[PDB]
Design an enzyme around this catalytic site. Structure first.
Site, PDB file in Angstrom:
ATOM      1  N   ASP A 263       0.847  -1.176   0.000  1.00  0.00           N
ATOM      2  CA  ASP A 263       0.000   0.000   0.000  1.00  0.00           C
ATOM      3  C   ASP A 263       0.889   1.235   0.000  1.00  0.00           C
ATOM      4  O   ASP A 263       1.824   1.338   0.796  1.00  0.00           O
ATOM      5  CB  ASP A 263      -0.929  -0.010   1.214  1.00  0.00           C
ATOM      6  CG  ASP A 263      -2.058   0.992   1.097  1.00  0.00           C
ATOM      7  OD1 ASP A 263      -2.134   1.709   0.079  1.00  0.00           O
ATOM      8  OD2 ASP A 263      -2.891   1.044   2.022  1.00  0.00           O
ATOM      9  N   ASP A 514      -1.737  -0.579   6.482  1.00  0.00           N
ATOM     10  CA  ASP A 514      -2.061   0.136   7.709  1.00  0.00           C
ATOM     11  C   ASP A 514      -3.555   0.390   7.855  1.00  0.00           C
ATOM     12  O   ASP A 514      -4.093   0.289   8.960  1.00  0.00           O
ATOM     13  CB  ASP A 514      -1.293   1.463   7.783  1.00  0.00           C
ATOM     14  CG  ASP A 514      -1.765   2.481   6.762  1.00  0.00           C
ATOM     15  OD1 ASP A 514      -2.288   2.072   5.710  1.00  0.00           O
ATOM     16  OD2 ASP A 514      -1.639   3.692   7.028  1.00  0.00           O
ATOM     17  N   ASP A 518      -7.461  -2.554   3.563  1.00  0.00           N
ATOM     18  CA  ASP A 518      -6.830  -3.822   3.240  1.00  0.00           C
ATOM     19  C   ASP A 518      -6.719  -4.757   4.435  1.00  0.00           C
ATOM     20  O   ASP A 518      -6.140  -5.841   4.303  1.00  0.00           O
ATOM     21  CB  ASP A 518      -5.460  -3.559   2.614  1.00  0.00           C
ATOM     22  CG  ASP A 518      -4.569  -2.696   3.480  1.00  0.00           C
ATOM     23  OD1 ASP A 518      -4.980  -2.302   4.590  1.00  0.00           O
ATOM     24  OD2 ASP A 518      -3.456  -2.373   3.018  1.00  0.00           O
TER      25      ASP A 518
END
Ligand SMILES: [C][C][C][C][C][C][C][C][C][C][C][C][C][C][C]C(=O)O[C][C]([C]OP(=O)([O-])O[C][C][N+]([C])([C])[C][O-][P@@](=O)(O[C][C][N+]([C])([C])[C])O[C][C]([C]OC(=O)[C][C][C][C][C][C][C][C][C][C][C][C][C][C][C])OC(=O)[C][C][C][C][C][C][C]/[C]=[C]\[C][C][C][C][C][C][C][C])OC(=O)[C][C][C][C][C][C][C]/[C]=[C]\[C][C][C][C][C][C][C][C]
Ligand SMILES: CCCCCCCC/C=C\CCCCCCCC(=O)O[C@@H](COC(=O)CCCCCCCCCCCCCCC)COP(=O)([O-])OCC[N+](C)(C)C
Ligand SMILES: CCCCCCCC/C=C\CCCCCCCC(=O)O[C@@H](COC(=O)CCCCCCCCCCCCCCC)COP(=O)([O-])OCC[N+](C)(C)C
Ligand SMILES: CCCCCCCC/C=C\CCCCCCCC(=O)O[C@@H](COC(=O)CCCCCCCCCCCCCCC)COP(=O)([O-])OCC[N+](C)(C)C
Ligand SMILES: CCCCCCCC/C=C\CCCCCCCC(=O)O[C@@H](COC(=O)CCCCCCCCCCCCCCC)COP(=O)([O-])OCC[N+](C)(C)C
Ligand SMILES: CCCCCCCC/C=C\CCCCCCCC(=O)O[C@@H](COC(=O)CCCCCCCCCCCCCCC)COP(=O)([O-])OCC[N+](C)(C)C
Ligand SMILES: CCCCCCCC/C=C\CCCCCCCC(=O)O[C@@H](COC(=O)CCCCCCCCCCCCCCC)COP(=O)([O-])OCC[N+](C)(C)C
Ligand code: BEF
Lengths: 768, 153
Positions: A263, A514, A518
């Site tokens: 990410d 984080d 996700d």
């Protein structure tokens, strides 16, 4: 829950189930010694498993809202528990939002930061009627919102995480897979001995005694204990490097992973806005032009806009924070506006020089005065071409200018900014590519801003929108996602599906996250990785949490992750051969001869194969540069042969004792004692061949493992000499004969395993 | 069987008769080898599988009924027999029938006089061994792409 998760650990896995079958059988036979050991050792598998899960569970729990409302027409303050959805709430600047809301009516438009949950590092200007998300931070303005539902990406996260976690793990799949096959071999050799024990009319107590002895060795009693211990002790090294695992199976999967998904927002980038200096305009002061920008900004917490805060610590001058206000004597300041989109400041200079400095969007700064610059249409095109370069570079664009007191503007230029990746994440990607795994990036941000992070990181800059070709509801899809360098504008249910494609094609997948977006994917992922800035839903759903800032701890984590595999790979190759040894050896002994090594001596072999390999966890191991394989068909074939080579060797030794004058007995010996002396020496040292890549002398054994085996060999030696649980005595001269002969078998085993393990052909033949 | 739970295939079903026959060829022989191992034990003096006293007809009928009846549990499940839990109607039907099979040989109805309980539990545990063998064969037949090709052609 704690008692429930413990008791499923006793049940789950075929190795464990037959132990109650062994335990009840030994209890029914009134052999309470055999009842104690396996039941005692079954708790030890839980003992390693439960204590780590409780202790590491304690750490993540150490890591783990009020609202202004109008009720019955009067304004009060209530916490977030009792808000009832479908009702109007009044939320103001700086608040954290409990739940999603629809903006009712606003005269000026809200800006909230979506970095926390869905990751956008640019504050989004939000309109009336817009969909607002929970847990965001308002950076601008006042508004009325009517709430939609209670906890809902938080509710979406919790539902999908509860939906996920099926498919216990890649490890437990192969751990059950070995457990099934060994149980088949137990049944295969039990039928051989039960056939023979019928033909010679045998009492049922005698047959079950043989059945008891075979099933202790055939399914390895210590293998659930050892392998969890091996990864748990390795996990303690992770905790000593600031990386905590929640469920153990991820650490071996972190060895076996070869796609890392990332990410951009929290994991890769510092989620603090920053400016690139080499990408600035032809302005005469490259460095002073950003110093102009800091002049046009607020200095205290009322007006600390998110972009304005980025400028204040952006200076290289040592007083960067103070340099924007060194005796400049601000008279008046223009706040940021939705429509004019400007901030300008009036400052006083020596000799009565009222000079003014501004910030704003490039179009609105460029049109302060149309004719102020020479060649006004060209400098129009000059920045707008540069902005066209800048927009294709994905940088958010901000223009600055300067005017004199009488009112003539001078356009200094345009300056870019974005969320930059960390210093180590440039390299942490780079030797992740060295360490054999391709990396991809999955973010909810725009494609173009993600393209910038691609070439900065050097990924490849081949990324695609999630919505346009990520399926709403495929083998051609499988080729695309695998060949895709990354996916941008991704939603939580797409991130799960990006993993879904890769698991189906056969890849092992680990991803770093984080946000709560996700976190559903984290539970699905083979190795769930969290970062130092991970959200609570992420850290609950992540299999591994990083306590250290940055992503650099994965290379430390991955290298020892592969070392744990080779520690386990050595043991599982070793332990199957021992079962396959005594299945053949006791199976034939009962068939041909209707005798066996006595039931008291059988259980000790199970302990000694166990306790010697408890020190595998502390053994040194080399990490492979490529992702690890877990090549099960070769593993089984290599353990097929080594057990037979043991089985031939024990059958050579046993039949010597059949001869008159002893054969291998020089003065006096015990037929059970010598073989238990023989078997224990031959079984235990088998770990030394398997622990080493190629030849057994390639790597020096660790003192923990070497001391464990050699002590166990001594305890094996004492048992036969004094004849405990066996025939009366065996002299020392017979014992040294067995030791030197067992060294001969050991040197034979080094030849076979070396000629199997490094051979390219045997891998092909056993696979097909 | 009518009340047993079953999974529906996503594709249209096949009725693949050449594989059906070949899979039943093998499982009957594996039963046939297993019953022939058990029968010839009773030929030996001192009983072989008879521990105290037994009936040669009774033990085999005890053997055959246990081995035949549980064969439904392997076949009812896709792949391994433990994949799907049997329904209580089927499981209760077989287990009751296994009990009625067990009573016949113990009291020796329509057979030689008596068979003791100790011989009976020997036949039961041995029949479990044959049952676990059958799970291996049927699984290695039913999910294997090759055996379908070889029996078809
Ligand atoms: C592929 C397929 C394969 C198939 C194979 C087939 C096999 C065949 C075998 C047959 C054999 C028969 C036997 C005969 C013998 C008789 O009969 O007897 C005679 C004798 C005498 O008589 P009498 O009178 O009875 O006497 C009496 C005595 N008494 C008193 C009894 C005594 O005692 P005791 O108890 O003690 C001890 C003794 N000793 C001396 C030894 C010490 O004991 C008892 C005995 C008797 O009993 C008997 O009978 C025994 C029987 C056994 C049989 C078993 C069978 C096995 C089967 C297995 C199968 C497997 C399957 C798998 C597949 C899948 O006594 C005595 O003495 C006797 C002697 C000994 C005998 C026996 C020997 C051995 C046998 C067998 C082995 C083999 C195995 C194989 C393996 C395979 C793997 C796969 O007289 C005399 O003298 C005798 C002599 C004769 C000898 C014979 C030889 C053998 C032949 C051949 C071998 C085999 C080959 C084939 C190969 C294959 C390739 C592939
Ligand atoms: C490549 C494959 C080949 C396989 C190897 C072939 C090796 C076999 C080759 C030779 C063994 C025969 C030795 C001759 C012995 C003669 C003397 C004798 O005592 O006879 C005995 C009978 O003898 C038998 O009954 C032998 C039957 C064993 C056959 C097992 C083959 C199964 C193969 C599956 C492979 C296994 C793997 C397990 C599954 C994982 C006398 O009968 P007894 O009265 O009971 O004995 C005395 C009893 N007492 C002392 C109490 C008084
Ligand atoms: C690879 C093959 C290597 C082994 C070759 C074997 C050749 C050597 C064979 C025999 C050596 C000579 C023995 C007899 C000589 C003396 C006569 C006698 O005393 O009677 C004996 C009869 O017992 C037997 O007959 C033993 C039968 C051996 C069978 C070996 C099985 C091999 C299977 C291996 C497959 C593994 C591969 C697995 C692959 C799947 C005594 O029997 P006892 O009751 O025990 O003792 C009484 C006490 N006393 C004798 C002290 C008085
Ligand atoms: C590559 C594989 C290599 C195989 C090598 C083959 C090695 C075979 C070579 C030699 C074996 C026989 C040696 C003869 C020694 C006998 C001595 C004697 O006097 O006769 C004895 C009888 O003997 C018996 O009672 C039976 C023993 C022979 C059976 C051996 C079967 C081996 C199975 C092979 C398995 C292979 C399967 C492996 C498949 C993987 C004396 O007994 P007795 O007269 O009654 O009284 C004795 C009195 N006394 C005690 C005072 C003496
Ligand atoms: C999948 C197909 C596999 C191939 C099938 C072929 C199998 C071969 C079938 C039958 C072979 C055995 C028949 C010989 C009988 C000898 C008679 C005899 O005298 O007994 C002799 C012993 O001799 C034995 O008992 C050895 C038997 C071991 C057989 C091991 C192979 C079983 C394979 C497992 C697969 C089965 C499951 C298969 C599926 C359910 C002596 O007996 P006794 O003198 O009276 O007693 C001695 C005194 N005492 C008690 C003090 C010691
Ligand atoms: C896979 C093979 C496994 C089976 C191996 C068999 C080895 C074992 C063989 C024999 C064990 C030893 C028996 C004799 C020993 C004692 C001597 C004696 O009593 O005489 C016997 C002679 O009866 C016989 O001879 C039995 C013949 C067995 C034939 C087995 C057919 C195998 C076909 C399988 C093909 C299936 C595959 C199908 C695929 C198409 C007594 O006979 P009885 O009149 O009945 O009894 C009298 C009472 N009394 C004994 C108490 C006194
Ligand atoms: C993979 C296949 C494995 C096959 C394994 C082969 C196993 C063969 C192993 C052993 C078989 C023989 C064991 C010898 C035991 C006899 C001992 C004895 O004393 O002699 C006996 C004679 O014996 C007979 O009367 C005939 C019995 C032997 C015929 C067995 C044929 C097996 C067919 C195999 C079919 C295979 C086809 C399978 C094809 C698919 C005694 O009889 P008696 O002297 O007259 O008086 C008895 C007095 N008493 C009662 C008091 C004792
Ligand atoms: F906030 Be994101 F999930 F990195």
């Amino acid at each position: 829950e704690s008692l429930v998760v413990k008791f499923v650990m006793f049940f789950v896995g075929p190795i464990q189930f037959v132990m109650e079958a062994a335990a009840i059988l030994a209890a029914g036979l009134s052999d309470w010694v055999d009842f104690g050991v396996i039941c005692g050792l079954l708790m030890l598998n839980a003992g390693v498993g439960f204590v780590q899960e409780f202790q590491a569970g304690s750490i993540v729990d150490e890591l783990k809202n009020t609202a202004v409302v109008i009720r019955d027409g009067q304004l009060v303050e209530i916490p977030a528990n009792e808000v009832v959805p479908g009702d109007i709430l009044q939320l103001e600047d700086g608040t954290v939002i409990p739940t999603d809301g629809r903006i009712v009516t606003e005269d000026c438009f809200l800006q909230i930061d979506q970095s926390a949950i869905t990751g956008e590092s640019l504050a989004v200007d939000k309109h009336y009627g817009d969909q607002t998300f929970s847990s965001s931070t308002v950076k601008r303005g006042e508004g009325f919102m009517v709430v939609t539902a209670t906890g809902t990406f938080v509710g979406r996260a919790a539902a999908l995480v509860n939906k996920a976690a099926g498919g216990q793990g890649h490890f437990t799949e192969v751990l059950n897979g070995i457990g099934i096959i060994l149980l088949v071999l137990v049944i295969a050799t039990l039928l051989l001995v039960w056939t023979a024990c019928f033909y010679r009319t045998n009492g049922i107590v005698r047959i079950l005694r043989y059945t008891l002895g075979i099933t202790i060795i055939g399914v390895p009693v210590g293998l659930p204990a050892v392998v969890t211990t091996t990864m748990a002790v390795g996990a303690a090294y992770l905790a000593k490097k600031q990386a905590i695992v929640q469920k153990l199976s991820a650490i071996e999967s972190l060895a076996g992973v070869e796609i890392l998904c990332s990410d951009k927002t929290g994991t890769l980038t510092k989620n603090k806005l920053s400016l690139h200096e080499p990408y600035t305009v032809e302005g005469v002061s490259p460095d002073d032009l950003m110093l102009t920008a800091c002049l046009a900004a607020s200095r205290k917490k009322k007006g600390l806009d998110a972009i304005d805060k980025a400028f204040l610590k952006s200076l290289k001058q040592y007083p960067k924070a103070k340099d924007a206000l060194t005796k400049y004597k601000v008279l008046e300041f223009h706040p940021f506006d939705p429509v004019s989109k400007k901030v300008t400041a009036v400052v006083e200079s020596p000799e009565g020089e009222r000079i003014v400095c501004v910030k704003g969007a490039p179009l609105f700064v460029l049109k302060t005065v149309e004719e102020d610059h020479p060649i006004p249409e060209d400098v129009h095109e000059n920045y707008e071409n540069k902005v066209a370069e800048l927009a294709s570079r994905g940088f958010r664009a901000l223009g600055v200018a300067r005017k004199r007191g009488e009112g003539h503007w001078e356009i200094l230029g345009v300056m870019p900014c974005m969320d930059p990746p960390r210093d180590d994440t440039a390299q942490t990607v780079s030797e992740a590519r060295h360490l054999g795994l391709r990396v991809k990036m999955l973010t909810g941000d725009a494609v173009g801003i993600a393209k910038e992070t691609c070439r900065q990181l050097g990924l490849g800059t081949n990324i695609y929108n999630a919505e346009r070709l990520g399926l709403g509801g495929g083998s051609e899809l499988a080729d695309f996602v695998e060949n895709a360098d990354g996916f941008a504008e991704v939603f939580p249910q797409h991130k799960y599906r990006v993993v879904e494609i890769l698991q189906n094609r056969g890849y092992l997948v680990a991803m770093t996250g984080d946000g709560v977006n996700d976190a559903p994917s984290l539970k699905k992922a083979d190795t769930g990785i969290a970062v130092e800035g991970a959200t609570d839903a992420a850290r609950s759903a992540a299999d591994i949490v990083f306590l250290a800032p940055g992503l650099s701890a994965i290379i430390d984590a991955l290298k020892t992750s592969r070392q744990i595999f080779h520690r386990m790979y050595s043991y599982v190759v070793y332990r199957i051969a021992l079962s396959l040894h005594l299945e053949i050896f006791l199976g034939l002994w009962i068939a041909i001869l209707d005798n066996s090594l006595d039931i008291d001596l059988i259980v000790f072999i199970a302990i000694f194969a166990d306790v010697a390999t408890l020190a595998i966890a502390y053994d040194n191991a080399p990490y492979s540069p490529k992702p690890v394989k877990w090549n099960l068909p070769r593993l089984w074939g290599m353990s097929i042969i080594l057990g037979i080579v043991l089985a031939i060797g024990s059958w050579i030794t046993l039949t010597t004792m059949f001869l008159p004058k002893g054969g291998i007995i020089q003065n006096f010996g015990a037929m059970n004692g010598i073989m238990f002396l023989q078997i224990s020496l031959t079984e235990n040292w088998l770990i030394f061949i398997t622990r080493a890549a190629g030849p057994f002398w390639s790597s020096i054994p660790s003192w923990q493992l070497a001391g464990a085996v050699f002590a166990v060999d001594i305890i094996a030696t004492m048992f036969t000499l004094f004849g405990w649980w066996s025939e009366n005595w065996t002299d020392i001269v017979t014992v040294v004969r067995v030791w030197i002969w067992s060294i001969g078998i050991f040197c034979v085993l080094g030849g076979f395993y070396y000629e199997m393990s490094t051979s390219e052909a045997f891998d092909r033949l056993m696979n097909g």
